[PDB]
């Protein structure tokens, strides 16, 4: 239609960019200053997941609304097949700080073989990263100084990137396959930040000691974006979707969040905690022993009153949606199955939209609308209150009134953003692990 915009795809990441053969896992975010930040996994040895790769985090920026992009940079790169995978972007609008979080594994580890727990030990009221020698003896890192099990200082120190120094000389890195002292082989959540609109980034902080429980095996970022709550009693809270496995390997979604501008973090309950399944069975994420109720990668949006909605990858074939009345600390016992939205067991993107559509608050959604990773479709969901819960809170559901096919054929992970002009940017996996495509769309197109 006249005035509709759907730009021809640009390969924002592609084989050879930053000398990486492969790319996967898009994240896309517009900063308060109007800059677009795109992050991605630079998968250097193919498209495979950790541990069968060496994966770094790459970032590109656009200062002109996505028309042109910079030359890129690598912002986290560990040695020897230690990988960072699955990025997410969020900003604290009060401080202008941008956050990027990612999952990190030492060499040889990934989802399936992750060890239990955080990899930290409490010594006299502070958590310290553990290191292990060849015989399995346990050491702790205390303000970057390595102590043995009898609390004697050793000759070793570390840095934030895991380099291992003997008397001040680098000898290895605690994430490698050869270091004489190694971190526990498990997942870790890393956090970096930028105070200059994404041009430069801090070195990673390992926040596992705050967010990973002793009974979790894997805990990872659910890739895409987070939110900062705009309304109500938890205004300002930074919310970052995650998912984890228990000791039996079964997956449940949650969010981690910060009320102090990213300094400290907490993990909330999963929607699988005290979940009431369809016919009344009650489950918990710690004890879940069946595949069918699993909840995995997810993205979160906010309702007009501040209520949160967690949209989740799951095994039902359809979108699942959880509701939180308390800023992501806990979820209502009922997970909605929205049979109007196919979910082929793939990551999805959902965002709030800043203007009403047809008189209603709205969200924008992207996923493969099929029983396979194909038929990539962007939707506009209109929020409607459909009643109240027994506790008197509003109950909201979505009217998926506008649904537009944007990518025939292959379509896997994706990430949306609203642009400064009110249009929609989208970065998507239109190939398995090679070209990652960016387009801009307007609502005239999406509603046509």
Q: Which of 274, 284, 374, 403 binds Ca ion (CB under 5 A)?
A: 274
| Complex with Ca ion: residue 50 or 130, whichever CB lies closer | 50
Residues 301-340 touching Ca ion, rule: CB under 5 A, are 331
Q: In angstroms, what is the minimal distance from the CB of 213 to Ca ion? A: 16
**Is 150 assigned a ligand-binding role in the annotation?**
no
Q: Is the CB of residue 363 less than 8 Å from the CB of residue 321?
A: no
Q: Which of 41, 49, 54, 343 binds Ca ion (CB under 5 A)?
A: 54
| Complex with Ca ion: residue 54 or 361, whichever CB lies closer | 54
Residue 390: active-site member:
no
**Is 396 assigned a ligand-binding role in the annotation?**
no
Q: Quick one: which segment of 77-85, 119-127, 165-173, 339-347 binds Ca ion (CB under 5 A)?
A: 77-85
Q: In angstroms, what is the minimal distance from the CB of 304 to Ca ion? A: 22
Pairing of strands 169-173, 22-30: unpaired
Instruction: Determine which one of 86, 172, 269, 297 is catalytic.
Output: 297
Long-range CB contacts (within 8 A, 24+) of 161-166: 161/78, 161/203, 161/204, 162/78, 162/82
Q: In angstroms, what is the minimal distance from the CB of 333 to Ca ion? A: 5
| Complex with Ca ion: residue 21 or 374, whichever CB lies closer | 21
Check binding of 435 to Ca ion (CB under 5 A).
no
Q: In angstroms, what is the minimal distance from the CB of 425 to Ca ion? A: 28
**Is 201 assigned a ligand-binding role in the annotation?**
no
Residue nearest Ca ion (C-beta atom): 274
Q: Is the CB of residue 18 less than 8 Å from the CB of residue 72?
A: yes
| Complex with Ca ion: residue 273 or 343, whichever CB lies closer | 273
Q: Quick one: which segment of 47-55, 225-233, 258-266, 303-311 binds Ca ion (CB under 5 A)?
A: 47-55
Q: Per-residue b/e over 400-435, b at no fewer than 16 CB within 10 Å?
A: bebebebbeebbbbbbbbbbeeebbbbbbbbbebbb
| Complex with Ca ion: residue 103 or 414, whichever CB lies closer | 103
Q: Quick one: which segment of 54-62, 238-246, 391-399, 425-433 binds Ca ion (CB under 5 A)?
A: 54-62
Q: In angstroms, what is the minimal distance from the CB of 138 to Ca ion? A: 27
Check binding of 77 to Ca ion (CB under 5 A).
yes
Check binding of 205 to Ca ion (CB under 5 A).
no
Residues 329-388 touching Ca ion, rule: CB under 5 A, are 331
| Complex with Ca ion: residue 310 or 351, whichever CB lies closer | 310
Residue 297: active-site member:
yes
Binding residues for Ca(2+): 54, 56, 77-78, 273, 331
Binding residues: 54, 56, 77-78, 273, 331
Binding residues for Mg(2+): 273, 331
What is the set of active-site residues? 49, 297
Residues that bind Ca ion (CB under 5 A): 54, 56, 77, 273-274, 331
């Amino acid at each position: 239609v006249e005035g509709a915009v759907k730009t021809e795809p640009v390969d924002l990441f592609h084989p050879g960019f930053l000398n990486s053969s492969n790319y996967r896992i898009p994240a896309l975010f517009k900063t308060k200053e109007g800059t677009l930040i795109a992050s991605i996994d630079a998968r250097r040895h193919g498209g495979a997941d950790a541990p069968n790769n060496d994966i770094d985090t790459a970032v590109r920026r656009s200062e002109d609304g996505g028309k042109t992009w910079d030359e890129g940079q690598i912002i986290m790169d560990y040695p020897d097949k230690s990988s960072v995978i699955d990025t997410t972007l969020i900003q604290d609008d009060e401080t202008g700080r941008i956050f990027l979080l990612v999952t990190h594994f030492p060499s040889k580890y990934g989802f399936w073989n992750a060890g239990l727990g955080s990899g930290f030990k409490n010594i006299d009221g502070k958590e310290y990263l553990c290191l292990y020698d060849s015989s399995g003896k346990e050491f702790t890192v205390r303000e970057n100084v390595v102590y043995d099990k009898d609390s004697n200082k050793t000759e070793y120190t570390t840095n934030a990137l895991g380099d291992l120094f003997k008397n001040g000389t680098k000898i290895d890195n605690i994430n490698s396959s050869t270091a004489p002292l190694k971190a526990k082989g498990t997942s870790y959540i890393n956090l970096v930040y930028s105070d200059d609109d994404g041009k430069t980034w801090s070195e990673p902080q390992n926040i596992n000691f705050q967010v990973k429980k002793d009974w979790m095996k894997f805990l990872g970022i659910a890739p895409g974006r987070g939110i900062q709550i705009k309304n109500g009693e938890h205004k300002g809270r930074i919310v970052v979707p995650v998912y984890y496995t228990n000791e039996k390997g079964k997956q449940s979604s949650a969010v981690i969040y910060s009320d102090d501008s990213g300094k400290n973090w907490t993990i909330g309950e999963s929607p699988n905690d005290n979940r009431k399944l369809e016919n009344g069975k009650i489950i918990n994420s710690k004890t879940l022993s069946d595949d069918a109720p699993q909840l995995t990668e997810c993205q979160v949006v906010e309702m007009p009153n501040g209520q949160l909605k967690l949209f989740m990858r799951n095994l039902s074939g359809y979108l699942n949606i959880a509701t939180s009345f308390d800023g992501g600390a806990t979820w209502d016992e009922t997970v909605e199955k929205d049979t109007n939205v196919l979910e082929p067991y793939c990551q999805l993107s959902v965002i709030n939209y800043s203007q009403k559509v047809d008189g209603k608050d709205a969200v924008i959604f992207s996923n493969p609308n099929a029983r396979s990773r194909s038929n990539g479709t962007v939707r506009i969901g209109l929020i409607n209150q459909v009643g109240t819960y027994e506790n008197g809170e509003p109950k909201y559901e979505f009217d998926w009134k506008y649904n537009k096919l944007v990518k025939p054929g292959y379509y896997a992970y994706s990430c949306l953003t609203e642009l400064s002009n009110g249009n929609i940017g989208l970065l998507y996996e239109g190939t398995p692990s090679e070209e990652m495509s960016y387009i801009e769309m307007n609502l005239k197109y999406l509603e046509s």
